[PDB]
Design a binder for this molecule. Structure first.
Ligand code: QOB
Ligand code: QOB
Ligand code: MG
Ligand code: MG
Ligand code: MG
Ligand code: MG
Lengths: 212, 226, 196, 222, 195, 232, 204, 196, 195
């Protein structure tokens, strides 16, 4: 599992891999690790897949009830805290979650909260979670700037997942991209890692270690 | 594994299924579980498959040398004593459970032997994961003064019980008949009741389906002249 | 397992059931637990079959070599050889052995060697899992200098009860009679002893 | 100590076609090295053109199927006999499974049917209720034997067009119901050969707009 | 969390708290503020188990803010620390205790005195001239024992604190990514933005 | 969570053309001690059902009382209690299967394996298994404990699949069951010679046979067996 | 912790008409971390080929050991070792370490130079010989390989068809295993020519 | 502990040793293990003394309250109350109880309740650690419809053997006779029963 | 010990190795050279269990130096790495194994090629363009995968190495006190004294 999200000039990029495992066995290569909480909020999946799916879907219901009652879009701060307060009630029971609640509101601007099943809630600019997080961080940290274009940011997120997919045995399958704007998230496709690797190798001149 | 031994009129018969397994996976569908210790002393092995092969070959080697030294045809009790003293030495860590049968100048014999070194005498024996299924059949149909044809039938029926009802056992039935004053006859795949049906589809691929990066000739020959 | 040896006027008789179990499965229902270490020195085996067979084979070897050099060994000598193996290898053995034999000088003798490797000379001895159920019965019914027929009945009735109550015991009751007259093997089937 | 779980073996397979879906499963029920039954149905018609199988620990599997069947019944009562769509059934099963998150149903669950556009649908669940729509899914004992074969023969993975040498992929042409059943049968014949817990019989439930049909095939009984 | 220090000088209390947040393998953040303002003249730094730390701190904050509104009055640092200690002492015999250690730095407006309270997760309270939690004291106390005076200025307190942080950066194995420093005095709470 | 104390061994059963046969020995073991020699482990419910129980005897006696109470309760305000609204084998089984699974789910199981054998209203044979885990399955032959390993192989030679059931007479089926009970007596250390057998036939009803014995036993060959290898 | 699945990797062998094929992936890892994409697991001693999966230090050690032993064999016998004889040598050598084994899954493949008969064999870590007619599988994706081989294989395939079958068996099995992949090699072996092909596959 | 109850022609007799041990120390050598739950319904206790006393006290209460409402309870009713406590609290109890009683309608009855909480109605019953040694003896020597003097001898001889072999049993042999005539207490000292 | 990196460029091998030695609570040293010269054109860096690392390295050094004297000849990097691997492969089934991971960087004077060998404590040998041991690879390989070229100069190799070290300093929790960098080429071994 490799998932990342970073704030930039044009909003937020969210990028995830697609692999799920049960030990050495590759259970699925088609896993949807970005949960569409609603049209304006995104959540990432790391740790146990059921816990992330279930609770971030539930979060979408709580966000919907908030805006029905308050006649106003829920803040990313408030949404993330609903989830972190919930998992904190279950602390010790054995929930396994690492997630980033991503959104773009008027009052906050683009915002990312890392929420985690032992109760942690952190606001930040760049987050990477999963077995392949360190690989993705390497690419992100050396190439990140606030003034990236939407096109270049999308590629950086895609390239950072590819880096992890290559080295980390438990990451791969395909890359799912999202771009979060104030008017909502925009899906930027599913990209098979098998095809993407060779495409990137040739065009970029990287991965000279690998024969192609 | 299902292995049986059955005494009859003028000898002894031994039988086994042909399935070897690694956990719930089948390693070999036509495994050979009947080991020759000497020309007229054979045995069937259950438990760890390497151990049953190794322990029979070692004893079979030493039995052969003993036979040459003494100028006498080997005895089942010699194989028995040598096997038990060896297995006992390793305190069950060599996981061989054997049914040892044969004919020699003394007569026909049938023994079992367990990994810890204990031995048992009998007219009918069974061993392995399918031993209870086999023993049910042997207890229902065995009698004194079986003929050769009846003993082969009873033995292979006992193996079949193991094949069908025990998940550890399967595929084919191997038999070895050791009759007094005769060559032992090893009947490999005596029964074959588990042939796979024809598949619905051929999966032969069109040539050039697989993507290739490089080709090269491998030099298997030695360094050449001139 | 239910095993016993009983001295009587003319010598000694060993008795045993025939059941060998691997848990609740009966691996052998016709086991011979009465084993010969010399012409008129036999033993009853209980505990690990591997261990008791290994011991009995070594003892038989030692007494064969004793006989070649020094003539017929005493029953006490046989029991001492058993003890030496059981005691010195107590950490690695699970063997409870009853040694019974006939001399002409000493007549019938019984020695029991429990788990520790201690030796106890007794008028009669009982051992194995099924023996627990017949301590009461055997103590009340044993007499010294019984006849052959009385001793066979004493053993037959005793082991019958042991078999009845102990799941680990069963099958046929085997016996071996040791007297000046020689060595006699007896067998008694379920239909005989169950109705007692 | 008491162990509340067990393993009854078995293997199941769901494949979604263009206007149909199949859910197949072997009929063998086992514990350890013993056979309990050579014919114990594992794939069930749950009503509303949905088929279901919960493979693994058979007690939990039966309990879950029973509760879902019941959930279909109460959906009709509470919402004016409305047809439960496959996506709605899938979400409902997530809540059934996750309801027991801290004492899971020890089963790998698959349902099959048609979506609201009439296209073939298969949904796959883990024991704690994470789920996902898929084209192809094997579950249970011999799932590791079957899935690689389905990647190759359904989705044409690692297959390319002759003469191009790796440049052009084999195109993803749709499979008929007869073609899918062939791959199902060969998957189970192959699994039966190499997995001791697979055998005896194969029961396939096919779902079309016309309803639910059954097909049964013998498998090797060793 | 890792390093939290506190020093009470003549006219103020200075709290220093590390910026690193590490989740096992990676350093997820290097700018984390491990502190909450309980009232205008009372600050609480905290360190302990992930999640519990912030949950506890904000829970205390909410309760003190509630008291302030109800009575239109700020509780003394002593009163706040006693409230906090009781909450932790209650917590230690709970089903799942708060695994949180705190320093409470406050300026008592009645007595015109700075006050520093050190409270561990068991509810062990002590008033100190300088304090720490975890391994921080092992490296720093020998320096504070030597250099500390009760009549120090705020600038001298900050210089002594720099020497403590330098010793930590030299001899601690963990990279704690520097410290955020905050001063509590008669005028309230302010952050030293360059350290 | 408990451990079984006083226990009952194999229950074996099979279908035949007109009904079902079930059998179980009369022993209550206390570990390796063969403590209680008169325990009935086949419990009839009405004239169309017999429930055979293995495992813990105290839990069996509890199940026995539940079934007794089920009959009483079914009769309440039920004019057709002895006719159309009598208890069916399928009703009795499902009830037990519900209880077994509920009890394992509270981590306090009834430590048993149960076979419900009977004939339905329409003449159909009913035979189904349930155990302490709530696991249920049906088959032409069913057996618990040692019977699963030794009886089933013998009984499956008579009825191997569904199509063999109409070809199997009650005489052939009973013969197979009685032989299986003998094999179990030879080979199960926690079995007894005395057993009970019940036949539920769609024509002749419920026949309950008590105080049966294993007979025609082969022991004579034991006399020739000497030593463990080299002895004479 | 489990020595046989630290490094990862797979080997498969198949027979055809007057030919054998043996193939392996190229991954070496430290559990999740990919370390090398050039770790070949197939070696040869004359015309006999040996694939080895499992713990990589033992893969290397055993290759060096069989090179040693086959070299001395050749000097004394004055001929190259045959696949049937080599199989017995592997079995002997593994079993001599019965209580401290090499954590490996060897696979022998080759054609007997005198009879022309195709030969394959597999072993467990202590030397039990599995001599199949059809195919042998080994490694962390052995289950996956069994599934592929059991459906894809048919007897008497010509060399260039056998190449496709074994390649697709390896590739699709490896893609369903986290610890296998990162490249692959297929040897096609005939009586007096051997072709070696590197396959293009996904690099995750 | 060695305890037994035996039905005979005129009713039933309960018998017990008097030894209570804490490991190898005899904490009480004159214990009364025969306890009264109703006028002519008594029990023998084995296992945890705390548990069996607690149970027996509760049963006595239940049967006292039964008697006030519905008249004299049957021996079966008493055994059922014992069972209800033993079965429903099996996880927290170590109690092996023999219930024995005399009705005029039913005459002498014996029910044994082993560890599990199962009930078994028997002609006679033996229990406690010392019972293992007298299964053989008791099975061979028990007859139905014995006289009072024969039953006292049967119990006296049986428990004598149990005491002889079991270290956990010893002291005096207590007995309680239940007939139409009433309730008779008997005691037998070591010097009497050891020489048997 | 902690971080050891290696990168083989066009004409040289560069080994970088951390300077920190930590014994539990304190950093005892911040200038430790985790390397030994085996021969004039072969360098070995190492990391693993305390004591074993140096004992193993010096033992290897002594043996290679003995070979050099006996034959008046320098062994190839390949030959040295094979010798080292065998020693570790022997070690893993010993009573007490050497818990040491090594990188062997050498310049083969016969082939005029730099060579980098990575060998773990089990005796697992691989020739690589770049390598690491422990958690170092997790942070650095993604950068090396991107930027590495086989025709890089020594100066480009050093710049890529700086980027690797910077990423380690950002995201690793442990303060490893920087790295000593050494270059192995046709002229032998030299240390980069400013990094
Ligand atoms: C990211 C990778 C990752 O972080 N993996 C860490 C381990 C995660 O737990 C793996 C997770 N996979 C799943 O959630 C997986 N489902 C299960 O593992 C279900 C396990 C049920 C176990 C059980 C215990 C007791 C009783 C019964 C069952 C997918 C298939 O659902 C994962 O892949 N995480 C990814 C996103
Ligand atoms: C008869 C069936 C039978 O008795 N099965 C019971 C289990 C047997 O062990 C299965 C056996 N299978 C094999 O032997 C299998 N290999 C192994 O079991 C290797 C075990 C290695 C153990 C070990 C040794 C040293 C160090 C660490 C571990 C073969 C088939 O590959 C089996 O098939 N038995 C058949 C004959
Ligand atoms: Mg990968
Ligand atoms: Mg018995
Ligand atoms: Mg099978
Ligand atoms: Mg892969």
């Amino acid at each position: 599992t490799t998932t990342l999200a970073f704030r930039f000039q044009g909003g937020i990029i969210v990028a995830v891999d697609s692999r799920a495992t049960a030990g050495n066995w590759v259970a699925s290569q088609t896993v949807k690790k970005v949960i569409e909480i609603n049209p304006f909020l995104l959540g990432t999946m790391a740790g146990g897949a059921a816990d992330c799916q279930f609770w971030e879907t539930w979060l979408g219901s709580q966000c919907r009830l908030h805006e029905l009652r308050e006649k106003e879009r829920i803040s990313v701060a408030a949404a993330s805290k609903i989830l972190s307060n919930l998992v904190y009630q279950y602390k010790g029971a054995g929930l396994s979650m690492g997630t980033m609640i991503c959104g773009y509101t008027r009052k906050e601007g683009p915002t990312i909260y890392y929420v985690d099943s032992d109760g942690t809630r952190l606001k930040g600019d760049i987050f990477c979670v999963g077995s392949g997080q360190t690989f993705a961080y390497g690419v992100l940290d050396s190439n990140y700037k606030w003034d990236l274009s939407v096109e270049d940011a999308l590629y950086l997120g895609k390239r950072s997942i590819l880096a992890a997919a290559h080295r980390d045995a438990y990451s791969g399958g395909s890359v799912n991209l999202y771009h979060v704007t104030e008017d909502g998230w925009i899906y930027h496709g599913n990209h098979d890692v098998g095809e993407l690797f060779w495409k990137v190798k040739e065009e970029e001149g990287s991965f000279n270690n690998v024969i192609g | 594994t299902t292995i049986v031994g059955v005494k009859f009129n003028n000898g002894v018969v031994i039988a086994a299924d042909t399935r070897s397994t690694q956990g719930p996976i089948v390693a070999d569908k036509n495994c050979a579980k009947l080991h020759r210790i000497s020309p007229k002393i054979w045995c069937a092995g259950a438990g760890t498959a390497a151990d049953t092969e190794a322990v029979t070959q070692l004893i079979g080697s030493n039995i052969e040398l003993h036979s040459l030294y003494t100028s006498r045809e080997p005895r089942v009790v010699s194989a028995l004593q040598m096997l038990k003293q060896h297995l006992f030495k390793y305190q069950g860590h060599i996981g061989a459970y054997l049914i040892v049968a044969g004919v020699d100048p003394t007569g026909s014999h049938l023994f079992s032997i367990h990994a810890h070194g204990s031995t048992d005498v009998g007219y009918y024996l069974s061993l392995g994961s399918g031993s209870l299924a086999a023993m049910a059949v042997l207890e229902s149909h065995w009698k004194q003064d079986l003929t050769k044809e009846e003993a082969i039938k009873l033995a292979s029926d006992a193996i079949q019980a193991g094949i069908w009802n025990d998940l550890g056992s399967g595929s084919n039935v191997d038999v070895c008949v050791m009759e007094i004053g005769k060559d032992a006859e090893y009947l490999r795949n005596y029964l074959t009741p588990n042939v796979r049906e024809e598949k619905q589809k051929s999966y032969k691929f069109p040539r050039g389906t697989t993507a290739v990066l490089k080709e090269s000739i491998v030099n298997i020959c030695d360094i050449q002249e001139e | 397992t239910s095993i016993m040896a009983v001295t009587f006027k003319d010598g000694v008789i060993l008795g045993a059931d025939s059941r060998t179990t691997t848990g609740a499965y009966i691996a052998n229902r016709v086991t011979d637990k009465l084993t010969r270490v010399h012409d008129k020195i036999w033993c009853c085996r209980s505990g690990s079959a591997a261990d008791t067979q290994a011991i009995a084979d070594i003892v038989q070897y030692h007494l064969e070599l004793y006989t070649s050099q020094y003539g017929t060994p005493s029953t006490e000598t046989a029991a001492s050889v058993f003890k030496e193996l059981c005691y010195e290898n107590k950490d690695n053995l699970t063997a409870g052995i009853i040694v019974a034999g006939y001399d002409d000088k000493n007549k019938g003798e019984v020695y029991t060697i429990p788990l520790g490797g201690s030796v106890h000379k007794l008028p009669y001895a009982i051992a194995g899992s099924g023996s627990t159920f017949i301590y009461g019965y055997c103590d009340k019914n044993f007499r010294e200098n019984m006849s052959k027929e009385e001793t066979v009945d004493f053993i037959k009735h005793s082991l019958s009860q042991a078999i009845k109550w102990d799941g680990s015991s069963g099958g046929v009751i085997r016996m071996v009679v040791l007297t000046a007259a020689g060595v006699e093997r007896l067998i008694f089937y379920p239909d005989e002893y169950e109705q007692l | 100590q008491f162990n509340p779980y067990g393993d009854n073996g078995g293997t199941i397979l769901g494949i979604a076609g263009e206007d149909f879906a199949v859910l197949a499963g072997d009929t063998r029920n086992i514990t350890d090295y013993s056979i309990n039954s050579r014919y114990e149905p594992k794939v069930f018609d749950c009503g509303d053109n949905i088929v279901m199988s919960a493979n693994g620990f058979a007690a939990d599997g039966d309990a879950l199927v029973k509760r879902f069947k019941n959930s279909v019944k109460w959906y009709h009562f509470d919402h004016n006999d409305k047809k439960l769509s496959i996506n709605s059934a899938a979400r409902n099963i997530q809540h059934l499974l996750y309801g027991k998150r801290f004492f899971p149903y020890y089963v790998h669950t698959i349902i099959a049917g048609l979506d609201e556009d009439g296209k073939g649908a298969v949904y796959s669940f883990d024991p704690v209720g994470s789920y996902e729509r898929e084209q192809c899914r094997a579950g249970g004992a011999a799932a590791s034997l079957i899935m690689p074969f389905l990647d190759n023969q359904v989705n044409f993975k690692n297959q390319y067009e002759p003469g191009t040498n790796g440049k052009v992929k084999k195109p993803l042409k749709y499979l008929s119901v007869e073609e899918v059943i062939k791959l199902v049968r060969d998957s189970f014949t192959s699994a039966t050969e190499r997995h001791i817990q697979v055998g005896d019989g194969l029961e396939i439930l096919i779902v079309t707009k016309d309803g639910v049909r059954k097909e049964f095939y013998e498998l090797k009984r060793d | 969390m890792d390093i939290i220090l506190g020093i009470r000088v003549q006219d103020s209390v200075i709290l220093a708290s590390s910026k690193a947040v590490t989740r096992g393998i990676s350093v997820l953040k290097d700018s984390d503020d491990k502190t909450r303002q309980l009232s205008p003249h009372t600050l609480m730094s905290f360190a302990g188990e992930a999640g519990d730390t912030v949950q506890f701190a904000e829970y205390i904050q909410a309760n003190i803010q509630l008291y302030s509104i109800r009575e239109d009055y700020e509780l003394s640092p002593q009163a706040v620390s006693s409230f906090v200690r009781q909450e932790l002492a209650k917590s230690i015999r709970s089903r799942r205790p708060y695994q949180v250690n705190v320093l409470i730095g406050g300026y008592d407006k009645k007595k015109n005195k700075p006050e520093l309270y050190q409270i561990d997760y068991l509810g062990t309270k002590v008033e100190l001239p300088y304090g720490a939690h975890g391994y921080s004291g092992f490296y720093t106390f020998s320096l504070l024992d030597h250099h500390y005076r009760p009549d120090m200025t705020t600038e001298e307190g900050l210089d002594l604190l720099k020497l403590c942080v330098q010793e930590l950066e030299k001899r601690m194995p963990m990279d704690f990514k520097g410290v955020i420093v905050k001063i509590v005095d008669k005028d309230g709470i302010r952050q030293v933005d360059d350290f | 969570t408990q451990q079984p104390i006083v226990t009952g061994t194999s229950v074996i059963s099979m279908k035949y053309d007109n009904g079902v046969i079930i059998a179980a020995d009369n022993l209550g073991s206390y570990g390796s001690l063969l403590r209680f020699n008169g325990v009935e482990r086949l419990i009839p419910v009405g004239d169309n059902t017999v429930v055979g129980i293995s495992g813990d005897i105290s839990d069996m006696q509890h199940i026995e009382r539940l079934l007794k109470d089920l009959v009483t309760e079914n009769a309440y305000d039920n004019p057709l209690a002895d006719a159309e609204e009598a208890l069916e084998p399928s009703y009795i089984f499902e009830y037990l299967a519900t209880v077994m699974y509920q009890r394992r789910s509270k981590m306090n199981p009834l430590w048993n394996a149960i076979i419900v054998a009977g004939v339905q209203s329409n003449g159909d044979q009913f035979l189904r298994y349930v155990n302490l885990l709530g696991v249920t399955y049906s088959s032409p032959t069913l057996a618990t404990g040692f019977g699963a390993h030794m009886a089933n192989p013998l009984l499956r030679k008579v009825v191997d699949r569904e199509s063999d059931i109409p070809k199997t007479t009650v005489q052939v089926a009973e013969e197979a069951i009685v032989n299986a009970m003998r094999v179990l007596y030879y080979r199960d250390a926690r079995s007894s010679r005395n057993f009970s057998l019940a036949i539920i036939d769609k024509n002749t009803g419920l026949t309950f046979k008590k105080n049966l014995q294993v007979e025609n036993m082969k022991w004579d060959f034991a006399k020739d067996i000497k030593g463990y290898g080299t002895q004479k | 912790s489990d020595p046989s699945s630290i490094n990862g990797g797979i080997v498969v062998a198949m027979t055809g008409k007057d030919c054998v094929a043996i193939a392996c992936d190229l991954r070496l890892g430290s559990q999740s971390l990919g370390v090398s994409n050039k770790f070949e697991k197939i070696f040869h001693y004359g015309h006999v080929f040996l694939g080895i999966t499992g713990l990589a230090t033992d893969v290397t050690t055993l290759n060096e050991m069989f090179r040693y032993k086959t070299n001395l064999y050749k000097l004394k016998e004055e001929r190259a070792i045959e696949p049937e004889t080599f199989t017995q040598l592997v079995s002997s050598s593994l079993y001599e370490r019965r209580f401290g084994p090499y954590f490996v899954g060897p696979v022998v493949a080759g054609i007997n130079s005198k009879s022309g008969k195709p030969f394959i064999a597999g072993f467990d870590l202590i030397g039990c010989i599995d001599e199949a007619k059809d195919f042998i599988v080994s490694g962390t994706a052995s289950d996956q390989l069994f599934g592929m081989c059991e459906s894809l294989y048919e007897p008497n395939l010509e060399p260039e068809d056998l190449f496709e079958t074994i390649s697709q068996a390896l590739l699709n099995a490896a893609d369903r295993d986290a610890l296998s992949g990162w490249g692959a090699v297929v040897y096609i072996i005939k009586k007096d020519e051997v072709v070696k092909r590197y396959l293009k596959m996904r690099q995750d």
